[PDB]
Nucleic acid binder design. Sequence first.
RNA 1: CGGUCCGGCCGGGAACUCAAAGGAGACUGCCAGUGAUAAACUGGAGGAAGGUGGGGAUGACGUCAAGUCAUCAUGGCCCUUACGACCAGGGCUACACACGUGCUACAAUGGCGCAUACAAAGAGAAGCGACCUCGCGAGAGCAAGCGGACCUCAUAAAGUGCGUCGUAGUCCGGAUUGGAGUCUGCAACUCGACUCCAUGAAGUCGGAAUCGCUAGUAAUCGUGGAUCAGAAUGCCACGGUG
Lengths: 100, 114, 127, 79, 99, 151
Amino acid sequence: AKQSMKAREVKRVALADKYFAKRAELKAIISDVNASDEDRWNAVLKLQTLPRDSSPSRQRNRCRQTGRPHGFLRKFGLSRIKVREAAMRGEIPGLKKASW
Amino acid sequence: ARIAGINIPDHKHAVIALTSIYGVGKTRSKAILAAAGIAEDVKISELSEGQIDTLRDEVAKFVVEGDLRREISMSIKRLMDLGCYRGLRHRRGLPVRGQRTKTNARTRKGPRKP
Amino acid sequence: NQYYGTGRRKSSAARVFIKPGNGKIVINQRSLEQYFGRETARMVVRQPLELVDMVEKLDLYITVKGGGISGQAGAIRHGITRALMEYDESLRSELRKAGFVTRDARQVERKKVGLRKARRRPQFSKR
Amino acid sequence: RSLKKGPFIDLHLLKKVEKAVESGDKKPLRTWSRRSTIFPNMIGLTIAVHNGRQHVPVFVTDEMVGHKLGEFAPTRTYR
Amino acid sequence: QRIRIRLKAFDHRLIDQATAEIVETAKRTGAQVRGPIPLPTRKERFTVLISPHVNKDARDQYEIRTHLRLVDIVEPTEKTVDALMRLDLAAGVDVQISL
Amino acid sequence: PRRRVIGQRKILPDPKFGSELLAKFVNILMVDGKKSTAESIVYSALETLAQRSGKSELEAFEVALENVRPTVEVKSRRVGGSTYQVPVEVRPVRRNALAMRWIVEAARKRGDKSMALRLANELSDAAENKGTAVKKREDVHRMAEANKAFA
RNA sequence: CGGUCCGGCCGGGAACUCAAAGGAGACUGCCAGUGAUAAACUGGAGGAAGGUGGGGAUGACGUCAAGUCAUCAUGGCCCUUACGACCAGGGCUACACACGUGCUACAAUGGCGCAUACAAAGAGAAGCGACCUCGCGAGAGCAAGCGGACCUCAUAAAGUGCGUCGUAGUCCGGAUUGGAGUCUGCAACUCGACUCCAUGAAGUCGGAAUCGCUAGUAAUCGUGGAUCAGAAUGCCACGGUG
């Protein structure tokens, strides 16, 4: 995709590692827990005040090369197009064409 | 014999026949015929007149017929008059629960016009 | 003495021991009648004991994994008939002619990219 | 529906409403919070909720409480 | 003690050189070796669309086979732990070692 | 097919009777690969048959079947516009297939309760020859004799 | 073979299934006949398999200025206080209509209720999540195990047996709408899925026309996966019956 849209998926990873991965993983338990406090949550109102792109929900996967949003494959971190280009040169190990 | 709703079921089985009330399905049924202590296979003819007036009291717990028809109609009217989304969909005859209208809303729109 | 056969059909794989002496059919520690609740599946495990003789002549203890009913049946059929040819030998002539010796090669055809199943194409439209 | 551990509102709406209840009723609030459950303490006010271009005046009745704010600004024109 | 070695690797000729080293290396330095028993073989499968834009029935089905081998050693000498630790194999083999 | 002249598959005989011709009848009656429940229906409606037409269970079938079996059919054939129904003398094997198939399309059409009723009553009426499966065989023997000209 | 809490569970066994490496096997090789003594063909034997045994992968020179500058690359043209860049809300989900591809139906070869059997192939650490406890249910609480032939997802369903419904727009059908919930998620109004109670449309096998299939095929029955916080009637794969 664009250079802007690849820059946006560094910005959204930068946050969600810093914040939610520690600090919102506290507050999602304080908003959960029924057998401790049912009045001084405060935390639901505090979860908004965190920057919005701290949520991992907001992260799309791109193909770590061309930046393409659709056609992703998690094992390889790549679009279906670049998987195949790389497969056939022999750059993905053990991967061959199948038949059965 | 007629039930606490101003209705008259048939000579089927009983759990089925109580479904014939507006406001009673198959779950309420089996729920009623139980508390009253009737077997559910048993018919309406082959049921004594103490065993029918126990049912009249049981179905008087639940909101049924012109209690219910009103209760629905009044709830729909809150939406229509208040002018929320769901009101605006009720009053145009379009589907309310987010279904597509480009094709297929044919229950909710009626047979079709050129 | 224990006379052995393997047999297979579809995903089923039966293993079949033949003892001398009597009528009796075991199959995953159940009666033949308990295990197969369909008449069609019964008179294919017995089939080979008809061309070759049994009323009360050999017991058989068998076990079977995988497939479903009529798969498991056919594996056992073939499993017996391997084990008969272990024991007697010169029954092959008669068994071959009914063709219970032929391991049945038919697997399910795989499903194929483009198609709804193995061969079922989607509905074509010219225009 | 938001399960019964929470109902939801934006802080920037909550605190702007606490003001114009406490101080006294006024020219209407301009929110973009369409996603925010109308509470009991909002009744009487005019809130002007964003439909996607125009903010649209909504006089908050008693009967509205529980519904979301976005339900009273429609987004799409139609005839 | 039981130590057991799960070898796994994408190439089936590369793995059973690395096995046959380890079965030799243990027997020579005084031990009773078990296996090398073949476990089953995770074959993954990826279908992919093959054109850059459209043509949904044009596809290319790839696989990765992962071969897997297990070698139990029942009698360790003090040499036999260090003889196998010091060993170095090809790059495409992954060794493990439980205790 | 053009080149590909071919053999054909050994069906198993029927487990109760040993009747190879009756196995073909459960196949013809089977739907959705449920041979189980075809056999239930057939074995039933031969009990209901053979009881009510003086016994023999193989041969209450084979009297009802012998009645619907055809002997000629048409075979439409273009010459240069108008289309000539030619009578043609039907094979030994295809006699049964057509018979069996017509019995069942007749049985599947009636308005009795079970299928094992419906079948039993269109094997009753075959053997005392009325009902739709022989009204089919008669309106095929019309077409062969009406177009006897053309052979 | 011994012993048993009747469980391959525990001594043990290395036979059998299975696992995945290495080999053998099928070549018109052998027999007869047909044929220009040819190539081959028709039949037979033995064989697990017989005449390319079944399935895939493998797509000649070229054809349509076919498709894709929005995966990527790229010649030229163009914009450069905007056609670039950041944000919140909306939209891509609109609905008088027309077409395509699917799913569910219209029912006794069936529907509902109670018991009961037989698969394969997969996935799993910001993950799969047992047991036990709470909830009508979706789920919740607690918490072993498992980077996994070990543990979890995970009870296959058609089937079978026993009961019941009686040809009725019905105990067929589930659309739609009301009420109340559950979960994921900063957030389910626009616009998620799933549960419970209620509601119970059309539909009684479809005009002209038209599609798929030659065998483990069609038909029918469930199972898994990728994408994915959540969102499969689609897609890719797996076995059952047949």
